[PDB]
Every structure is written in structure tokens, then in C-alpha cells.
């Protein structure tokens, strides 16, 4: 499949949203990424 | 150290297409009994492996001449074909 | 030590398949430190990384058989598997036969042996399939 520029920006964003909650937020809140999406297990849009 | 003749006729009990694998077990079992050591301690030089797998996995020779040496503190045996 | 990454690089460096590249068992640690392609090329020069020779099927037993068949042997009724017209195409055999017969008659006209009246009579008979071979054509011309 051939992706467009906008489709690429969205996929790019979804990949960034897939990073873990930083180590410092755990210490600041004194103690979970609920939007964890896998390439196989989960499904994106379009 | 001595030269022994290992009979591999008990490899017929195991299915035909897997005779070579059982032949290798039988060699390790024989040398451990006759040299009074553990099966983990017996080391078979690749020459024995190639001798038993010569005609494939199914046609293993009924006998095999083998030269084995015995030494060390815990006790072990290095073995090869001749 | 995991040398599978290097096996991929060596196979591209030597331009040989992954299954044909050999690594020295005594030099595993030196190959484990081989990060780049320049590191691999250096180990190829050192002889540590080598490419095995590719197999080629021996045509010797086929050649002996080709000699026998060219001499007319081993083509008996017990060796034929295909039908007759499958072994030799009839349309192609007629093309071979009639072209040869028309080339003979063309030469005999230029030679002066046959006149444009005798030639026409034979060409039309050849196109009607009156002659089996070129020898059978000559056997008709000579009386």
C-alpha cells in the first residue's frame, strides 16, 4: 500500500503515542499507558 | 585405555528413521558402564558421530570399534573411532 | 556469542549465499567483535571468513548416454514413453523433407539438368507428396 503525506503524519503520531510514561512522572505522582497499541494485536485507523 | 566393540543392535527397538540418534545414546551408555563413569562425563569425538551417521539416519552399523581413554580427578572418558 | 548478524554481512561482502559462508571455529571471538563491513572484509583477507564452493551436477553420465543415443542405441520400444508424433513432429518433418526436395530441384534447374517444364512437373508432384526423400526424387528423375 502507498501512503500519503497526511497518512504518514498520523502513523508517525501513533508511533510516538506508543512510547512509555517517563520514569519521572512515576516519582512526581508517587505512583500505566492505557493507549498501548501493537502492530499485530491491535488495529489503527484507515 | 582400551579398544572396545560396541554392539548397536538395540537401536532396532527404536523406529527405523531414528536409528542413528539411539546408536549415539547406546555408545555413551556402554562406555559409561564399562569404564565406570557417568554418562555426562563421556566425550565422543566427532569421528564416532560420522561413523554412525555414515549411511544416513536409518542404516547404522551393527557394531563399532572404539578407542577410549580414562583419566582425571572427577573421572571422565574421551572416546574416538579407529 | 551470536554470529548470525555477521553471517548476513559476510554473505553480501562475498556475494555468496548465507548457507555457503564459513566461519573459523577458533576465531569466533574475533568475528564477534566484527561490527562493520570493513571488519568483515579484513577477516575475509585474514582467511577467517571464507566462501564454500558451489555444486554443479555431473553431466558425465549424461554425456555417455548422449553418445549412445547419437549412435542409435538405448532408444528401443522399452525406452519410449511419449507417443510417436510427440517424439518427432509430423508437420516439422514434412517441412524438413519438402524444403530439401525443393532445394534439390532449384539447384538442378540452375545447373541446366532440368528445364522449366520438367521442373514444374516435379515441383507440383513434390507438393503433392509423391516423393518420400530426396533420394526417392532422384530415383524418379533417372528414368
Amino acid at each position: 500500500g502507498k501512503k500519503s503525506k497526511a497518512t504518514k503524519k498520523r502513523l508517525a503520531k501513533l508511533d510516538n503515542q506508543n512510547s512509555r510514561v517517563p520514569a519521572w512522572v512515576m516519582l512526581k505522582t508517587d505512583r500505566r499507558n492505557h493507549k498501548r497499541r501493537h502492530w499485530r494485536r491491535n488495529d489503527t485507523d484507515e | 585405555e582400551r579398544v572396545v566393540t560396541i554392539p548397536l543392535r538395540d537401536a532396532r527397538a527404536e523406529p527405523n528413521h531414528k536409528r542413528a540418534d539411539k546408536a549415539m545414546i547406546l555408545i555413551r551408555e556402554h562406555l559409561a558402564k564399562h569404564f565406570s563413569v557417568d554418562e555426562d562425563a563421556v566425550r565422543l569425538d566427532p569421528s564416532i558421530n560420522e561413523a554412525a551417521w555414515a549411511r544416513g539416519r536409518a542404516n547404522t552399523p551393527s557394531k563399532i570399534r572404539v578407542r577410549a581413554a580414562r583419566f582425571e580427578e572427577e573421572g571422565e572418558a574421551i572416546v574416538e573411532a579407529e | 556469542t551470536d554470529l548470525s548478524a555477521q553471517k548476513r554481512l559476510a554473505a553480501d561482502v562475498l556475494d555468496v549465499g548465507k548457507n555457503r559462508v564459513w566461519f573459523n571455529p577458533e576465531r569466533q571471538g574475533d568475528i564477534a567483535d566484527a561490527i562493520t563491513r570493513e571488519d568483515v572484509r579484513e577477516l575475509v583477507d585474514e582467511g577467517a571468513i571464507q566462501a564454500k564452493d558451489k555444486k554443479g551436477n555431473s553431466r558425465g553420465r549424461a554425456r555417455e548416454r548422449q553418445k549412445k543415443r547419437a549412435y542409435g542405441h538405448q532408444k528401443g520400444a522399452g525406452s519410449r514413453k511419449g507417443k510417436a508424433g510427440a517424439r518427432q513432429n509430423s508437420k516439422e518433418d514434412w517441412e524438413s523433407r519438402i524444403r530439401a526436395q525443393r532445394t534439390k530441384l532449384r539447384e538442378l534447374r540452375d545447373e541446366g539438368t532440368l528445364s522449366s517444364s520438367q521442373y514444374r512437373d516435379l515441383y507440383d508432384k513434390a507438393g503433392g507428396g509423391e516423393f518420400d526423400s530426396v533420394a526417392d526424387l532422384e530415383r524418379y528423375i533417372d528414368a
Binding site: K5, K8, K9, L11, A12, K13, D15, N16 | - | -
Partner: protein, 81 residues
Amino acid sequence: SWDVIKHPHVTEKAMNDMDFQNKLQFAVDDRASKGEVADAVEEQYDVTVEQVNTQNTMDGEKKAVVRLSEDDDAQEVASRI
């Protein structure tokens, strides 16, 4: 309004292009053309750009590979900034 050059792209592959091919890599704005990237580099750094190669990265940004002339040295330009 949007600026053309966002920040320099400094990675291992970016340094190889700088040391051997005299190329400076930049993370630019995705609406910028090859010509607009060329002009902005010649103005912000005082160099002469020969060729620009753009790629839309899987980061949502546009990566531009900018080749300088022989008069300019990429290693010297990246060291001052």
C-alpha cells in the same frame, strides 16, 4: 509565520555525510521546498549550497540533506553552532 530550519539533525549517519561527503543534515518544516531549504542555509550560515535532498521522516518532520561547495567545510560549520 513558520521558520524553514527547525534544528540540525545530528546522528551517526549525519556525521558520516559531514566528514566524508561535505553534507549537513537538517530537520526542516514540512511545507518547505528544496529551493527554500537551500536559501535559508545560505543565509543562516553564509555558505554555498549545491544540492538538497528531502525526505519526510516517520516523525512527522522533513529531513533535508544539504551538500555544500568545495570552498566550504561542513565540519567547520557544524562546530561553531
